[PDB]
């Protein structure tokens, strides 16, 4: 049909209109952030229509809008896979991006080049919608690398400080360590299947796709940050908070797990891939959760929350239940956006200070922000009817109703408890205790570019999971016949984590000199994984790159072997040759020697 | 400027060949070379063997 | 940032810097104000004891022992003020601190958009050019003949003079442009 | 010393001719050099060359190949023929040796 | 860094806009060629094997 | 016709014209197989004397 | 082709007979027009290639190099206009004549039918380059650089002459169409392996291999700019073209005489990019990146597959454009600081926020950005190498990582940071040197929009 | 377009069959979309079509006639070899486009059958595998310098292997 395709293409066209007008002379004479915000709003309103059509008929179109080039039986062409996942992610991303745009018009004033910030956000969203709607894999890689660079540029927004740049280069490094596996998979599918489109890769379903799936594992490990490549995500907080909320908690951090969701029919048959996904995701969900404990910066706490819930989603892909992982994507979006925007309100209200030890009594001095933040934290936990239930309940139900691995189950349960714990930690140290902030109070929660976006995300975080779950078509069959201590295990364990954190954060109010531990620093520091690896691995790399590469091969030994040997040989032959003295006696003696050699050669050869 | 000159042009004048220079250079030049030689050689030999035996799974390899 | 450090760096400010960073890491541990106040009074007691020793081979070992027991209780994530090193907002606005000399390359279409500013700026530069030679002479005729010197930058003694080496202190870009 | 001239110090341009472009000292020559560059490089080359290259037909016999492929699959599958046999030439006119 | 952009866009639009208008007017009123078969001993010219008017104009004249 | 500092603009167009003439001369030189190739070999049309010149 | 290289000769009297004040303008505009008329030979509506005479031909491998050579000349000519502006007019005109001679000879190379024509022209290219490097370089190492750059080439090329002479005495023609249709399988003896080496180790020097590359940094670092543009853009590709032409008469020896060179290229690519990670000199960083790129082209041509030759062509053109662009960007700062040391000036993007976009785009071209003819080439030769052996991606991935690293490090430690406030001599910008980067980048975007042209013999 | 080259089964859709006494926003938005977008667009395209038909122009396909193949060609005669290599390269490009057509058929079948594709998309699967094996026995293990002579040597080696096989009783 025309309506469906027309709307899909019109979304991208609307999103490109701001980038067009930015390269014009019309950024002046208008208000560019409002124009962009309105473009995102109209794009969302248009994207609703494909969503309703799909919920009605469930058709999963496929478009090939433009042919690019043929390469000996390989038609590279722009083509979109407009399935369930694409539409449901497009709508959600546009919602969150509209809200983040209003916020980033409130926040980020005091910046003259705010329009550059807005343009970069639009470009990230465009690369994300390319990555998310793709049918090929070259197009998907375009969006992949686009997300990567956009994160480099937005993390490194304030290009004066030499920590944002380190964060950006770090992100780039880990994303490339993922892109190795991406390119490995792309190479394998090109060589064997002679194509990059999913419609052919689906015919590899019984073909021992081990190493391409390992490549996709590495790719999503790097992008949707997991343990082996985890550090870049909390380090991607030196950038502004709307950057964090939009990219590093909803979209760039979900690219790779979306990719694994899009390759689920190949994983049904490989069990080793499932097993390693399970163990790796569980490791992340434990590690980042216990590391969020004993953190003072809010932004890092939300980063580790993202990593933990993302490990839970990779745990879900560890079994044949990817659609539930995608529901958790679409629901996690609202929580993280709201949390980061409440954090940014709390921050920009007072000075740039982001640490809960100087935040104080926010239930009373900011009722709106506290209300929304508590709603978001409760929904992040498995609260029974706020869009965290409608995934997480089914998640834990599935994982304690499956026969895979017991340590993964156990540490995921502990990690859910820890989710309750650090949510309670924020709610205590930020929202309940007495004021620790400085005494000049300059709070202003009243701005319609602030309250309306978090209000929209709150209606989201209360209603959208209900709506989605009761509108989507049924897939990924659920199991529900089981004892009571498995249907209420997430609720129980979240409540119990809340209780423990309440008690333990009350324990600090009394007077007793607490001490450091071998624990509490493996959490405060990140298992010392940064503090070791980031200063040995580059050390040996760079030392081996100067010596043993430049000043050992190229500058001494390749000069001593090939050119300088030649020079010394020819000049030494010159010296022993042409250092003659002007005496005809010796010349004529040599002439006689030549006479003798010529006659001897004649007598011999003959 | 002194730094750049010490790290660009003042190298070979002060380079004196010694043990732990010559052996180190021979290793770091010709070792990875030989390692990757035998890796790729084993792979290609195994591949052409399994081809000429008339076995290899190349069910869709078209573009190569 | 404005005052330059000495070489010797005697005992007293070592002890005081220890007191400061210890109280700060204690504030980090003792998050709530009542607890930090209690333990700060206890720490001031710990420092008041051994305040008067007259034994520079006992106070130094007390210093070393105190620094060691500080390092064994150094908070890993202490409090750091923003706009301070190791913290947020430190060099954030350094991307927005353009120097003064960039105006020398402006066109006469932007300078026409701000005429009174450049009217004052030209006479500022004239002041600079006038005071430079006397400033150089003053720094030349006040050199420590023994050889040793500091980054102390003596002031102007006479009238009509300007405090030497001031164009980089004055004219330093604002911290929030 | 050996009687050489000293280094001429750092020239600034925009003092003289603050509309300097990058080409010459004469303000007229800079203008009529940048106009030349912009015109001859953008407006004719990067425009008309793109047009020429875009309206070249059947670059390396591509559209033709697709059309022939279409009619040939049509013929071969209408007449029950084996589409794309496994030997380009016929053994009707190939002579192999014995042993 | 704005003068350059103004001149860039000006000199590029100068022949982009007339050229683009030419493309559109050709494609509307002088549109593409249809397919046909050889009418039994016609021997076409070489440009009659091409589709677009611009392309076959180029071919008729300069090739 | 004063102060011809602009006649030099004829050298490169002259070179272009001359080069096209020389290529024309070369493909006049190579007028063998003009209608003898096994692929085209068409009989001459009623008003035709050469096939591609 | 004659219609392309006769006007190129007429550009020389256009220099010498024009006014001192109206010589850069006329020659620049007319060079742009030569570039325009060098698009007629993209009219290939057929599979058969374009023979204009016994001398000249043009295949889809020739044509991109032809067009790029004709297109670089205006860019070299405008980039060469700030320095040697205070030079005497005759010296200017001599520079112009050398650049135009390079244009003519290189077009003749890429258009040649025989290998001896290609030889004498491939070697005639040395004289302009040497003159440019030596009379107009700023430093004193330019002389040793010229000696290296000349004698590496000649050492490699004398055996090439001997092998071509042998092939003439054996076959009779040395023309490339006939050597294609008449090529006898080789008996696989030492007398033919030496022939392989003699035919190849002239081009492999010029590309270059990692065993022999010391001429390329010493020349790029010391040539003024335009020499660096050419030496990065087409003189390296003048070896790849030759390999692609001459390999057809060396089968089946390429199946086993190629292991050492593939291996050297791969490992030394890693070595060179690691060097680029840690290098005080910006103009040397670009050069070692060029080595690390051309090594892939070496391996690709050695594999002799369609994907591989294709990606080689793509990488050739892309690398040429983006490398010339990066050399221009470094020269833009060198014309002010007069220092190649990169960590000297490290806090730009305040004063030059638009050039800092050209920097970014030039680097993203350099690293593997997908919608780009750089990643298409790198990916297709990676796929060819994986087909060849699956254990090569382990090296290509290390290269990809280091190649993101050194490029982003270049950008950061040159642009991002705190401005070096002690640099009052950072003049705003030149419309000339902005148009330069625009003319380097706009082709990349266009060719990405249509890479059907930029492929080679095989597609 | 040509539904014999590019076959498409008929898009049989079920009748709506509603149960609610409530509205569907899809259909009324479709009416609005039609009478807003499709009507002026159809007007414009009908205008453009009649302006085409005012001055209609035709183009052809250039039937290339067959030529003596290389097996009928003498070792050294470069003219015959040139013509044969040319017609071979022509057929080669055509074969790549055939392979592309069949891959396109396979993908479209996979999408329309969607979930239940590995039981009723086997026809196009086998039609892909057969032509794939043909290409593999026809063009695969050559290199960049493929030619009629190399394909012929390959065919000859393979016929020799087949003869040696069928030698066995
Ligand atoms: C489907 C697949 C499609 C491919 C999708 C690609 C995905 C990859 C994404 C790459 C992300 C790169 C990135 O981060 O952007 C950096 C880059 C940063 O620029 P910036 O720092 O904001 O510039 C401000 C200056 O610093 C401050 O100076 P200013 O304020 O004066 O600048 C104003 C503006 C002015 O720009 C212009 O004036 C445009 C000049 C062309 C004029 C057009 C004439 C029209 C007539 C034609 C006939 O910007 C510029 O000066 C840059 C000019 C160069 C533009 C290059 C165009 C790249 C398009 C690639 C396609 O973003 C851009 O502005 C580039 C344009 C956006 C990229 C294209 C988006 C995709 C569009 C689909 C094609
Ligand atoms: C109710 C309101 C009614 C609205 C509709 C009115 C109809 C209308 O607009 O006029 C119809 C009229 C066409 O009527 P028609 O019935 O469709 O005629 C059939 C086609 O013209 C027959 O085709 P054609 O030969 O005329 O083609 C014309 C050609 C136009 O071509 C040109 O103009 C040549 C360039 C001119 C240079 C100017 C300087 O258009 C194109 O093919 C587009 C070129 C490609 C541009 C996009 C490239 C994106 C690449 C992105 C890079 C990444 C690739 C993806 C990688 C990932 C894949 C896996 O419009 C035009 O003629 C289009 C004007 C072209 C503007 C180009 C400007 C480019 C800047
Ligand atoms: C394919 C790979 C092949 C590559 C071949 C490349 C050949 C490149 C040759 C260039 C060599 C130039 C080296 C000069 C470096 C500069 C050093 C310097 O500053 O001058 C010092 C040097 C003498 O230094 P020293 O070794 O101490 O000698 C005195 C000790 N009694 O003073 C000098 O000696 C000046 C240098 C004299 C050079 C002598 C002649 C060189 C001949 C080159 C080979 C020609 C080809 C022959 C083919 C057969
Ligand atoms: C071969 C040379 C190699 C060496 C480099 C030489 C550099 C000098 C170049 C001089 C200028 C000539 C440039 C030639 C390359 C561009 C040709 C081109 O534009 O391709 C046509 C392109 C696509 O149009 P189309 O023909 O419909 O699609 C092709 C698929 N069959 O038409 C277009 O789409 C153009 C408009 C798209 C612009 C998009 C801008 C995005 C922002
Ligand atoms: C038209 C102006 C816009 C052109 C933009 C792009 C042009 C690129 C290619 C131009 C060169 C090709 C050409 O124009 O043909 C050369 C022509 C000789 O053609 P010839 O084979 O000798 O026989 C023709 C008789 N039917 O010789 C000619 O007479 C062509 C004259 C026009 C060349 C214009 C290019 C310079 C501007």
From Swiss-Prot, chain C:
Matches recorded under Pfam families: Complex1_LYR (PF05347)
Positions carrying Phosphoserine: 84
UniProt cross-references to InterPro entries, sorted A to Z: Complex1_LYR_dom, Complex1_LYR_NDUFB9_LYRM3, NDUFB9
Lineage of the species this protein comes from: Eukaryota, Metazoa, Chordata, Craniata, Vertebrata
Subunit structure: Mammalian complex I is composed of 45 different subunits.
UniProt record, GO biological process: aerobic respiration; mitochondrial electron transport, NADH to ubiquinone; proton motive force-driven mitochondrial ATP synthesis
Gene of this entry: Ndufb9
Name of the protein this chain belongs to: NADH dehydrogenase [ubiquinone] 1 beta subcomplex subunit 9
Record-listed N-acetylalanine modification sites: 1
Record localization: Mitochondrion inner membrane
UniProtKB/Swiss-Prot annotation, chain D:
GO CC annotation: mitochondrial inner membrane; mitochondrion; respiratory chain complex I
Location in or out of the cell: Mitochondrion inner membrane
One of the protein's GO biological processes: proton motive force-driven mitochondrial ATP synthesis
Topological category with respect to the lipid bilayer: Single-pass membrane protein
This protein's record includes keyword Transmembrane: yes
Record's keyword terms, sorted: Electron transport, Membrane, Mitochondrion, Mitochondrion inner membrane, Respiratory chain, Transit peptide, Transmembrane, Transmembrane helix, Transport
Transmembrane region(s): 36-56
Job of this protein: Accessory subunit of the mitochondrial membrane respiratory chain NADH dehydrogenase (Complex I), that is believed not to be involved in catalysis. Complex I functions in the transfer of electrons from NADH to the respiratory chain. The immediate electron acceptor for the enzyme is believed to be ubiquinone.
Subunit structure: Complex I is composed of 45 different subunits. Interacts with BCAP31.
Family: Belongs to the complex I NDUFB11 subunit family.
Protein name: NADH dehydrogenase [ubiquinone] 1 beta subcomplex subunit 11, mitochondrial
Organism (species): Mus musculus
Classification lineage: Eukaryota, Metazoa, Chordata, Craniata, Vertebrata
Curated annotation (Swiss-Prot), chain E:
Coiled-coil annotated spans: none
Compartments reported by the entry: Mitochondrion inner membrane
Family listed: Belongs to the complex I NDUFB5 subunit family.
Membrane-spanning segments: 10-30
Gene of this entry: Ndufb5
Subunit structure: Complex I is composed of 45 different subunits.
Official protein name in the record: NADH dehydrogenase [ubiquinone] 1 beta subcomplex subunit 5, mitochondrial
Function summary: Accessory subunit of the mitochondrial membrane respiratory chain NADH dehydrogenase (Complex I), that is believed not to be involved in catalysis. Complex I functions in the transfer of electrons from NADH to the respiratory chain. The immediate electron acceptor for the enzyme is believed to be ubiquinone.
UniProtKB/Swiss-Prot annotation, chain G:
GO biological process, one term: aerobic respiration
Pfam families found in the cross-reference section: Oxidored_q5_N (PF01059), Proton_antipo_M (PF00361)
Transmembrane segments: 23-43, 60-80, 90-110, 113-133, 147-167, 194-214, 224-244, 257-277, 284-303, 308-330, 350-370, 392-412, 434-454
Bilayer topology annotation: Multi-pass membrane protein
Top-level taxonomic group: Eukaryota
UniProt keyword terms in alphabetical order: Electron transport, Membrane, Mitochondrion, Mitochondrion inner membrane, NAD, Respiratory chain, Translocase, Transmembrane, Transmembrane helix, Transport, Ubiquinone
Broad enzyme group: translocase
Location(s), subcellular: Mitochondrion inner membrane
Presence of the UniProt keyword Repeat in the record: no
Listed EC numbers: 7.1.1.2
PANTHER family (UniProt xref): NADH-UBIQUINONE OXIDOREDUCTASE CHAIN 4
Family to which this protein belongs: Belongs to the complex I subunit 4 family.
Function: Core subunit of the mitochondrial membrane respiratory chain NADH dehydrogenase (Complex I) which catalyzes electron transfer from NADH through the respiratory chain, using ubiquinone as an electron acceptor. Essential for the catalytic activity and assembly of complex I.
Name of the protein this chain belongs to: NADH-ubiquinone oxidoreductase chain 4
Protein species of origin: Mus musculus
């Amino acid at each position: 049909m025309n309506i469906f395709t027309t709307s899909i293409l019109l979304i991208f066209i609307l999103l490109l209109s701001p980038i067009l007008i930015s390269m014009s002379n019309l950024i002046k004479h208008i208000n560019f952030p409002l124009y962009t915000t309105t473009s995102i709003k109209f794009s969302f309103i248009i994207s609703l229509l494909p969503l309703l059509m799909f919920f009605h008929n469930n058709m999963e179109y496929m478009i090939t809008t433009w042919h690019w080039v043929t390469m000996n039986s390989m038609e590279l062409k722009m083509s979109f896979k407009t399935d369930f996942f694409s539409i449901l992610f497009t709508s959600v991303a546009l919602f969150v991006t509209w809200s983040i745009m209003q916020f980033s018009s409130w926040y980020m004033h005091s910046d003259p080049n705010i329009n550059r910030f807005i343009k970069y956000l639009t470009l990230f969203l465009i690369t994300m919608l390319i990555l998310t709607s793709a049918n090929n894999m070259f197009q998907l890689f375009i969006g992949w690398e686009g997300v990567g660079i956009m994160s480099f540029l937005l993390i490194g927004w304030w290009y004066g400080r030499t920590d944002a740049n380190t964060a950006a280069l770090q992100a780039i490094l880990y994303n490339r360590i993922g892109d190795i596996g991406f390119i490995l998979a792309m190479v394998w599918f090109s060589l064997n299947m002679n194509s990059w489109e999913l419609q052919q890769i689906m015919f590899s379903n019984n073909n021992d796709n081990l190493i391409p799936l390992m490549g996709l594992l590495i790719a999503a490990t790097g992008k949707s940050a997991q343990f082996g490549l985890h550090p870049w995500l909390p380090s991607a907080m030196e950038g502004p908070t709307p950057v964090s909320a939009l990219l590093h908690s909803s979209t760039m951090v979900v690219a790779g797990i979306f990719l694994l969701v899009r390759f689920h029919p190949l994983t049904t048959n490989n069990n080793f891939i499932l097993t390693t996904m399970l163990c790796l995701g569980a490791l992340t969900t434990l590690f980042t959760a216990i590391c969020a404990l004993t953190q003072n910066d809010i932004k890092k706490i939300i980063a580790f929350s993202t990593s933990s819930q993302l490990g839970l989603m990779m745990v879900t892909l560890g079994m044949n239940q990817p659609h539930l992982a995608f529901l958790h994507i679409c629901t996690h979006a609202f929580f993280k956006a709201m949390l980061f925007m409440c954090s940014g309100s709390i921050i920009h209200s007072l000075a740039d200070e982001q640490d809960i030890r100087k935040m104080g009594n926010i239930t009373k001095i900011m009722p709106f922000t506290s209300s929304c933040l508590v709603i978001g934290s409760l929904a992040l936990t498995g609260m029974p009817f706020l869009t965290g239930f409608y995934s997480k309940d089914l998640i834990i139900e599935a994982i304690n109703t499956c026969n895979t691995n017991a340590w993964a189950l156990l540490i995921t349960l502990i990690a859910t408890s820890m989710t309750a714990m650090y949510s309670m930690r924020i709610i205590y140290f930020v929202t309940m205790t007495k004021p620790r902030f400085p005494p000049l109070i300059s709070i202003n929660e009243n701005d319609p570019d602030l309250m309306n976006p978090i209000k929209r995300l709150a209606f989201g975080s209360i209603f959208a999971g209900f709506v989605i779950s009761y509108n989507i078509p049924p897939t990924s069959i659920p199991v529900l016949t089981m004892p009571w201590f498995l249907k209420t295990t997430a609720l129980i364990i979240s409540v119990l984590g809340f209780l423990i954190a309440l008690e333990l954060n009350n324990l600090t109010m009394k007077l007793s000199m607490n001490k450091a531990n071998p624990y509490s620093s493996f959490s405060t520091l990140l298992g010392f994984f940064p503090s070791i690896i980031h200063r040995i691995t580059p050390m040996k790399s760079l030392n081996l790159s100067l010596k043993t590469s430049l000043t050992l091969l190229d500058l001494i030994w390749l000069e001593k072997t090939i050119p300088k040997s030649t020079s010394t040989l020819h000049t030494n032959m010159t010296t022993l040759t042409t250092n003659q003295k002007g005496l005809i006696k010796l010349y004529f003696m040599s002439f006689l020697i030549n006479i003798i050699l010529i006659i001897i050669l004649y007598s011999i050869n003959l | 400027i002194r730094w750049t000159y010490a790290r660009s042009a003042n190298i070979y004048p002060n380079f004196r060949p010694t043990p732990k220079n010559s052996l180190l250079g021979a290793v770091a030049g010709f070792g990875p070379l030989i390692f990757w030689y035998y890796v790729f050689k084993t792979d290609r030999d195994r591949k052409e063997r399994l081809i000429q035996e008339g076995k290899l799974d190349r069910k869709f390899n078209i573009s190569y | 940032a404005f005052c330059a450090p000495p070489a010797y760096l005697t005992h007293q400010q070592k002890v005081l810097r220890l007191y400061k960073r210890a109280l700060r890491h204690l504030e980090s541990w003792c998050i709530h104000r009542d607890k930090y106040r209690y333990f700060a009074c206890l720490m001031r007691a710990r420092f008041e004891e051994h305040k008067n020793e007259k034994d520079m081979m006992r106070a130094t070992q007390l210093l070393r022992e105190a620094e060691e027991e500080f390092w064994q209780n150094q908070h890993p994530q202490p409090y750091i003020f923003p706009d301070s090193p190791g913290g947020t907002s430190f060099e954030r606005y350094e991307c927005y601190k353009v120097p003064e000399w960039c105006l020398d390359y402006w066109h006469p279409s932007e300078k026409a958009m701000y005429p009174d500013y450049f009217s004052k700026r030209e006479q500022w530069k004239k002041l600079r050019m006038e005071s430079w030679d006397r400033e150089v002479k003053q720094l030349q005729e006040e050199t420590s003949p023994d050889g040793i010197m500091t980054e102390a930058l003596p002031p102007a003694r006479r009238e009509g003079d300007l405090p030497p080496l001031w164009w980089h202190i004055v004219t330093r870009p604002r911290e929030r442009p | 010393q050996w009687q050489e001239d000293p280094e001429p110090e750092d020239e600034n341009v925009y003092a003289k001719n603050p509309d300097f472009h990058g080409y010459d000292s004469d303000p007229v020559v800079d203008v009529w050099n940048m106009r030349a560059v912009f015109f001859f490089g953008f407006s004719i080359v990067l425009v008309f060359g793109t047009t020429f290259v875009a309206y070249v037909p059947d670059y390396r016999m591509q559209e033709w190949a697709r059309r022939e492929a279409e009619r040939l699959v049509k013929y071969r599958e209408v007449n029950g023929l084996p589409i794309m046999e496994s030997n380009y030439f016929d053994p009707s006119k190939i002579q192999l040796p014995e042993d | 860094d704005a003068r350059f952009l103004r001149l860039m866009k000006f000199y590029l639009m100068l022949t982009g806009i007339p050229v683009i208008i030419g493309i559109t007017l050709v494609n509307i009123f002088i549109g593409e060629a249809e397919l046909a078969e050889i009418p039994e001993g016609y021997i076409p010219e070489h440009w009659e094997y091409y589709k677009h008017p611009i392309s076959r104009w180029i071919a008729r004249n300069f090739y | 016709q004063l102060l011809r500092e602009h006649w030099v603009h004829i050298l490169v167009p002259a070179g272009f014209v001359f080069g096209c003439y020389l290529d024309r001369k070369d493909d006049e030189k190579l007028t063998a197989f003009r209608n003898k190739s096994m692929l085209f070999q068409r009989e001459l049309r009623p008003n035709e004397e050469v096939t591609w010149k | 082709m004659l219609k392309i290289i006769l006007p190129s000769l007429m550009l020389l009297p256009l220099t010498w007979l024009s006014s001192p004040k109206k010589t850069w303008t006329n020659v620049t505009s007319y060079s742009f027009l030569i570039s325009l008329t060098s698009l007629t030979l993209l009219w290939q509506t057929d599979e058969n290639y374009k023979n204009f005479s016994n001398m000249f031909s043009s295949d889809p491998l020739s044509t991109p190099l032809i067009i790029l050579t004709a297109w670089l000349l205006p860019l070299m000519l405008m980039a060469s206009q700030n320095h040697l502006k205070k030079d005497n007019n005759v010296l200017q005109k001599l520079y112009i004549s050398m650049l135009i001679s390079l244009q003519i000879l290189l077009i003749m190379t890429f258009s040649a039918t025989e290998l001896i024509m290609f030889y004498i022209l491939f070697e005639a290219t040395l004289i302009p380059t040497l003159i440019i490097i030596t009379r107009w370089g700023n430093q004193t190492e330019r002389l040793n650089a010229g000696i290296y750059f000349l004698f590496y080439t000649l050492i490699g090329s004398i055996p090439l002459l001997i092998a071509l002479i042998l092939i003439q005495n054996h076959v009779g023609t040395l023309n490339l169409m006939i050597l294609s249709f008449t090529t006898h399988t080789l008996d696989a003896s030492w007398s033919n392996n030496l022939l392989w080496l003699a035919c190849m180790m002239a081009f492999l020097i010029k590309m270059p291999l990692y065993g022999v590359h010391l001429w390329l940094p010493k020349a790029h670092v010391e040539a003024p700019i335009a020499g660096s543009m050419i030496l990065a853009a087409i003189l390296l590709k003048l070896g790849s073209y030759g390999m692609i032409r001459i390999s057809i008469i060396l089968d089946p020896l390429t199946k086993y005489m190629a292991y050492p060179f593939i291996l050297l290229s791969l490992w030394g690519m890693i070595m060179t990019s690691s060097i680029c990670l840690r290098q005080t000199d910006l103009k040397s960083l670009i050069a070692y990146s060029s080595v690390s790129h051309m090594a892939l082209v070496i391996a690709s041509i050695m594999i002799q597959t369609p994907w591989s030759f294709m990606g080689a062509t793509m990488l050739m053109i892309a690398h040429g454009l983006t490398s010339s662009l990066l050399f221009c960007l470094a020269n833009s700062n060198y014309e002010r600081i007069h220092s190649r040391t990169m960590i000297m000036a490290r806090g730009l993007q305040m004063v030059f926020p638009l050039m800092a976009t050209w920097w970014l785009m030039a680097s993203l071209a350099n690293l593997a950005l997908p919608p780009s003819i750089n990643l298409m080439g790198e990916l297709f030769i990676t796929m060819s190498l994986f087909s060849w052996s699956n254990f090569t991606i382990i090296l290509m991935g290390i290269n990809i990582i280091i190649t993101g690293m050194y490029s982003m490090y270049m950008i950061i430690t040159t642009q991002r940071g705190k401005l070096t406030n002690h640099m009052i001599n950072l003049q705003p910008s030149h419309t000339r040197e902005l148009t330069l980067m625009a003319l380097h980048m706009i082709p990349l975007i266009l060719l990405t929009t249509s890479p059907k042209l930029i492929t080679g013999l095989t597609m | 377009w040509d539904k014999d080259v590019y076959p498409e089964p008929p898009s049989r859709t079920p009748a709506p069959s509603p149960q609610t006494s409530l509205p569907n926003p899809i259909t009324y938005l479709t009416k609005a979309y039609d009478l807003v977008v499709d009507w002026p667009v159809t007007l414009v395209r009908e205008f453009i079509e009649r302006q085409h038909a005012k001055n209609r122009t035709y183009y052809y396909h250039r039937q290339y006639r067959r030529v003596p193949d290389i097996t009928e060609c003498k070792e050294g005669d470069v003219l015959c070899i040139y013509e044969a290599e040319m017609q071979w390269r022509r057929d080669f490009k055509v074969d790549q486009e055939i392979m592309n057509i069949i891959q396109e058929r396979l993908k479209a079948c996979q999408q329309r059958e969607g979930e239940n594709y590995q039981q009723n998309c086997a026809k196009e699967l086998e039609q892909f595998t057969k032509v794939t094996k043909a290409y593999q026995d026809r063009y695969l293990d050559l290199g960049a310098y493929y030619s009629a002579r190399k394909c012929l040597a390959k065919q000859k080696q393979r016929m020799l292997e087949e003869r040696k096989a069928a030698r066995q009783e």
